[PDB]
């Protein structure tokens, strides 16, 4: 028995990289 | 899902799914027509038969929380 | 409330008790706010928490509300069982608290576990000793 | 005869007859009450020869809403709820003994934890391959329920046709009595032949042809956990037994003309802890949730009434043979060391 | 043993903690353990163990 | 022993205390005196004040325990003295009315009197004398008497024999046996008695 | 100017682990999960056999700093017993005392 989902193969989104990078200062 | 939920909402529950039911047969044994959703579930009684069974769910379970969901019960029910 | 009640505690090897003991009550008695025919559902443990109100025959008279932590089940009934009866000496005559000292029930219990020494299976268990 | 009352008649106990004893014949004994009576109460109507029961509040405010049921509306889930040892089995006992005195059926299940532990021969359910059967657990009861509702059996007669083997078949028309005899004889089809009952029951009372009631101790077994294994020793759910399977279906309140009561147990309960008694500290969510809307009953210790006259009825029968026991300090320590409680009381004063 | 809700919402947690996103079994587990601590040689208890 | 030779054993008894001062005597005073001045051990959790408290009952409770499991070693006893009753008023009801004047339904009072049925009025000390061991006949002290009993019990209790049998119902079966001068550990005293009768001649050893 | 051979060779053991540590740790890498294929764990099991031995670190021993005993040391003072006894009982090792309770 092999379970596989779709959104268990879904990456996830760099948000650091993109997202959130203007936090890394002040 | 209502599983991953981590605070009880009586709206769209299993009790509300039981109680509407029952009180449907109760009508029905009257032979009463008034099957509406909006006025079963609006009246008093209900209220404080939700305010019971989540305050079952969400606070702590003990003997006064149980007697309080039994005297609700039995208005509903029409046990005396 | 302006209750009168007394407060003391009682040491029995690793366990520690504090008991409040009212000067009026029903008889009821709270462990770790659990009843006590509950907390210790061993007879005997039982027995220990009625020898200080019976041997004054005070029976049914005062509530009890004791928390104890440590030790096992025996010597939280024995930490209990001390901590009552200094308690209860503040609602009964002179001549009945040398009573309670003279049957033991204001002594504290000094035996406790003794330690175990190198060379030694126990604390006086020695290994088995060969003659040849 | 001061916890002894003359009224043997269960439908006119009142709050009269509070701790008061009464006498159940021999008679309803071997009929009403062939299980479900707590191991420890037997040896008492054993030894004393005879089955006296207390009458306290719980079991009357039960027998109250009994009076005034109505059969038009859907069955009324009752539940006894206590801390451990503090009567609620005989309570619901003393329940089944009203009904079955008013001609009521009786489906009585006398602990719903045997089904969900130490079952040694759990057998793949041939009606449903995905189920499993309990040919011990289910022959037993099916003899116990012939014994109870003995005289119901012709009069019941069953509206479908039922199939249990290529050569053998149960046809429409014929009396009940002949599927529960069919599962007593049929190890094998006992589990199916409880299913069938409970399905004919359930389905025939809605029809006014008889009052039933369910009477379930220790029913949060139905929806908790099983110590049953596979054979590759994986858990087992419990609806995945077929006789838990058509259990749950009788505690719905989708049916009307009866009325079920049911009374829980920690003893013997699997994966719960001591000190627990609460409804859905015991049932669960999945246990509270089938059951509601439910009435809850809550059962106590001794009052001191109930507690004077207890001890009277030992010292009735002689059973307290200590000589300090009748004085008024051996009470003291009685009521101390049990806290009024039912069963330590009881299992105190046997070996007094 | 996880609903949907629950799996992203820890994928979506280790994603935010710098924790492993992708399914990892045990054994290639100890990859992550080698290289979040120094070395048993590289201890300054073993190469600097004697005067 | 924690405790200093200073301390005194508690004395358990509420009729004791509750003496009137006129019935005390001149030493029993002094006594009363005395004990308001001396260390008291703590009561032992054992020994209660309960007017169903047996002495008897508990030092049996304790030959029984096996690696400290007193709740085990008194569920025992409980169930014995449950048993007995339970057997002796099943026989009551079975008998006529003239023999219900004569069975006995006290647990306590069947239990007190088996022990005593079977302890042993004189023993047998191996005297080393003529490089021999001769079984000389000797007066056995109270304390020494009352341990055979419960010793004796206790072992024919445990013997393999017995197969698949519960100790409550080992325990009660030979209690009454022996409240009624018959079974095994009746016999063993007979059989003590019966050897130092027969080596009487050699009373003459013992040396106090 | 060491206590003995097999001392001398014991930091010859920590010297040359300490130099491969970091080479050998990346490939073991290779080698200890399941997402590699095996045929580069294969070849990664040939590299790491072809280091020197001395380099690996389950050769090295914990031995005494001032006698070299190889048994019966403390790690925390990295002193066999006997040692540590003769420091601690002239009252030479802070904080430590005969104990008794
Ligand atoms: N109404 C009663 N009349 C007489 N005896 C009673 C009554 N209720 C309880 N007892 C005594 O107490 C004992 C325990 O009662 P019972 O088995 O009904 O308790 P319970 O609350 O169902 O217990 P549990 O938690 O073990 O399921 C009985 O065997 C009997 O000796
Ligand atoms: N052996 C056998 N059992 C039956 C038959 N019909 C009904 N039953 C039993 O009757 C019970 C009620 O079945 P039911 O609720 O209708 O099955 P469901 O529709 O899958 O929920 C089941 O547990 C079956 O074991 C039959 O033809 N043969
Ligand atoms: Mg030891
Ligand atoms: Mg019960
Ligand atoms: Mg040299
Ligand atoms: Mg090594």
């Known amino acids: 028995l092999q379970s596989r989902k779709e959104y268990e193969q879904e990456l996830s989104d760099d948000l650091h990289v993109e997202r959130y990078r203007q936090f890394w200062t002040r | 899902t209502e599983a991953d939920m981590e605070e009880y909402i009586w709206e769209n529950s299993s009790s509300e799914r039981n109680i509407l039911e029952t009180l449907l047969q109760m009508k029905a044994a009257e032979k009463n027509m008034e099957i509406n959703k909006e006025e079963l579930l609006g009246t008093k009684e209900i209220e404080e038969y939700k305010k019971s069974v989540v305050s079952l769910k969400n606070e702590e379970e003990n003997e006064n929380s149980i007697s309080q969901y039994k005297e609700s019960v039995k208005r509903l029910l029409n046990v005396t | 409330q302006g209750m009168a009640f007394s407060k003391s505690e009682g040491k029995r090897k690793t366990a520690k008790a504090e008991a409040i003991v009212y000067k009026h009550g029903s008889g009821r008695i709270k462990v770790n706010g659990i009843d006590y025919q509950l907390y210790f559902p061993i007879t005997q443990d039982r027995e220990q928490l009625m020898f200080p109100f019976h041997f004054v025959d005070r029976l049914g008279k005062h509530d009890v509300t004791c928390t104890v932590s440590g030790g096992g089940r025996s010597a939280q009934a024995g930490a209990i069982r001390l901590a009552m009866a200094k308690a209860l000496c503040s609602f009964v005559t002179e001549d009945e608290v040398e009573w309670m000292r003279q049957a033991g029930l204001l002594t504290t219990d000094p035996r406790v576990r003794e330690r175990k020494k190198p060379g030694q299976e126990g604390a006086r268990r020695k290994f088995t000793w060969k003659k040849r | 005869a001061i916890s002894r009352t003359n009224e043997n008649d269960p439908a006119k106990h009142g709050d009269q007859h509070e701790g008061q004893h009464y006498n159940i014949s021999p008679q309803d004994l071997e009929t009403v009450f062939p299980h479900g009576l707590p191991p420890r109460f037997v040896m008492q109507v054993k030894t004393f020869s005879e089955a006296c029961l207390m009458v306290r509040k719980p079991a009357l405010e039960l027998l109250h809403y009994l009076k005034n049921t109505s059969f038009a509306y859907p069955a009324i889930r009752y539940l ?259 806290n009024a409680n039912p069963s330590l009381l009881e299992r105190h004063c046997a070996y007094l | 043993s996880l609903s949907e809700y629950a799996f992203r919402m820890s994928r979506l947690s280790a994603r935010l903690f710098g924790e492993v996103t992708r399914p990892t079994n045990s054994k290639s587990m100890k990859v992550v353990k080698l290289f979040s601590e120094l070395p048993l040689a590289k201890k300054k208890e073993t190469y600097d163990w004697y005067p | 022993s924690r405790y200093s030779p200073e301390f005194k054993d508690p004395l358990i008894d509420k009729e004791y205390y509750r003496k009137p001062v006129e019935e005390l005597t001149e030493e029993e005073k002094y006594v009363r005196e005395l004990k308001k001045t001396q260390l008291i051990k703590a009561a032992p959790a054992g020994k209660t004040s309960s007017v169903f408290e047996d002495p008897v009952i508990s030092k049996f409770t304790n030959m029984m ?44 009072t069947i239990f007190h009197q088996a022990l005593k049925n079977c302890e042993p009025m004189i023993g047998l000390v191996p005297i080393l004398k003529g490089g021999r061991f001769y079984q000389v006949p000797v007066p056995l002290p109270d304390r020494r008497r009352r341990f055979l009993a419960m010793k004796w019990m206790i072992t024919e209790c445990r013997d393999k024999k017995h197969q698949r049998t519960l100790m409550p119902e080992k325990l009660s079966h030979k209690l009454l046996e022996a409240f009624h001068n018959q079974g095994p550990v009746i016999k063993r005293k007979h059989d003590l008695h019966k050897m130092a009768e027969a080596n009487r001649a050699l009373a003459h050893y013992r040396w106090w | 100017h060491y206590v003995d051979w097999r001392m001398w060779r014991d930091v010859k053991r920590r010297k040359m682990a300490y130099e491969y540590a970091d080479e050998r740790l990346r490939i073991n890498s290779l080698r200890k999960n399941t997402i590699l294929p095996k045929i580069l764990q294969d070849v990664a099991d040939e590299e790491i056999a072809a280091l020197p031995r001395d380099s690996c670190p389950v050769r090295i021993r914990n031995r005494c700093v001032m006698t070299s005993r190889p048994r019966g040391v403390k790690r925390r003072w990295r002193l066999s017993r006997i040692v540590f006894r003769h420091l601690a009982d002239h009252g030479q090792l802070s904080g430590i005392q005969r104990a008794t309770w």
């Open chain 4, 80 to 338: 006894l709820y206590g801390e451990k040892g503090t009567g609620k089995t005989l309570s619901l006992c003393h329940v089944i003994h009203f009904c079955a005195k008013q001609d009521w059926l009786i489906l009585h299940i006398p602990d719903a934890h045997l089904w969900v532990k130490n079952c040694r021969d759990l057998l793949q359910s041939s009606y449903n391959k995905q189920r499993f059967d309990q040919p011990l657990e289910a022959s037993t009861w099916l003899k116990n329920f012939k014994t109870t509702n003995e005289r119901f059996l012709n009069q019941i007669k069953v509206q479908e046709k039922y199939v249990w083997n290529k050569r053998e078949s149960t046809e429409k028309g014929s009396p009940l009595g002949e599927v529960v005899e069919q599962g007593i004889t049929r190890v094998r089809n006992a589990t199916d032949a409880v299913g069938i009952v409970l399905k004919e029951l359930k389905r025939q009372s809605s029809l006014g042809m008889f009052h039933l009631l369910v009477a379930v101790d220790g029913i949060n077994a139905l929806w908790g956990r099983t110590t049953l294994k596979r054979e590759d020793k994986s858990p087992i759910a419990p609806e995945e037994l077929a006789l838990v399977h058509n259990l749950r279906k009788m505690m719905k309140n989708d049916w009307h003309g009866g009325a079920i009561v049911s009374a829980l147990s920690q003893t013997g309960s699997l994966f719960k802890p001591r000190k627990a008694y609460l409804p859905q500290e015991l049932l669960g969510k999945e246990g509270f949730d089938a059951l509601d809307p439910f009435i809850p009953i809550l059962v106590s210790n001794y009052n001191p009434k109930e507690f004077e006259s207890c001890i009277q009825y030992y010292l009735e029968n002689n059973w307290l043979q200590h000589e300090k026991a009748p004085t008024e300090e051996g009470k003291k320590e009685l009521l101390f060391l049990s």
């Open chain 6, 65 to 108: 325990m096996i690696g400290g499991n007193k709740v085990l070693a008194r569920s025992l006893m409980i169930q014995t003295l449950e048993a007995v009753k339970r057997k002796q008023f099943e026989k009551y009801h079975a008998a006529s009315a003239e023999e219900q004047a004569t069975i006995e339904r006290n647990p306590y």
